[PDB]
Design a protein around this ligand. Structure first.
Ligand code: MNR
Length: 152
């Protein structure tokens, strides 16, 4: 797990996200979609978005970004005690949305990129280490649920 110090770093970084949840959410999804276009195909509501301009101009994409990061923030603030919060997410993503764990790796990487991009020089080595651990933990706990379900 993460140490108390590490959790404190994670939630300190998360302060940045909470000052502009929609802006961070939007940039994360744009980073995901642009770098990994196959991921767009998992969203019937975003498949029409043929350019990054269209993405940036989509109010509904920003709205979804807010839903996404609010859910992740809820999870993070549990500091690893997130079984109740994580289980239904794991299950909807495997069973309904059919999201391979690879795409969760992609979005983890996107969050790290976006934090650097929006806060250059203000996302230190220790912070990146802590946030990365927290995201791997999220990812790994989801992967356990995927295995249970036999979802690939
Ligand atoms: C590559 C694609 C996917 C990735 C990566 C991804 C990563 C993440 C993620 C990681 C930080 C969090 C937190 C996250 C959280 C959500 N997510 Mn998710 N998600 N996610 C979807 C694709 C993806 N998610 C799709 C598709 C829906 C349904 C969208 C619609 O309303 O049409 C959805 C829906 C949701 C919903 C709405 C409730 C539900 O359906 O369970 C939440 C909350």
């Amino acid at each position: 797990g993460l140490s108390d110090g590490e959790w404190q770093q994670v939630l300190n970084v998360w302060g940045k996200v909470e000052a502009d949840i929609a802006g961070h959410g939007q940039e994360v999804l744009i980073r995901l979609f642009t770098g990994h276009p196959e991921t767009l195909e998992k969203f019937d509501k975003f498949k029409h978005l043929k350019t990054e301009a269209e993405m940036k101009a989509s109010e509904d994409l920003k709205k979804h970004g807010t839903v996404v990061l609010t859910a992740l923030g809820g999870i993070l603030k549990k500091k690893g005690h997130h079984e109740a919060e994580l289980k239904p997410l794991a299950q909807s993503h495997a069973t309904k949305h059919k999201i391979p764990i690879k795409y969760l790796e992609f979005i983890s990487d996107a969050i790290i990129h976006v934090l650097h991009s929006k806060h250059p020089g203000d996302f230190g080595a220790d912070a990146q280490g802590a946030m990365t651990k927290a995201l791997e933990l999220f990812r790994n706990d989801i992967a356990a649920k995927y295995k249970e379900l036999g979802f690939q």
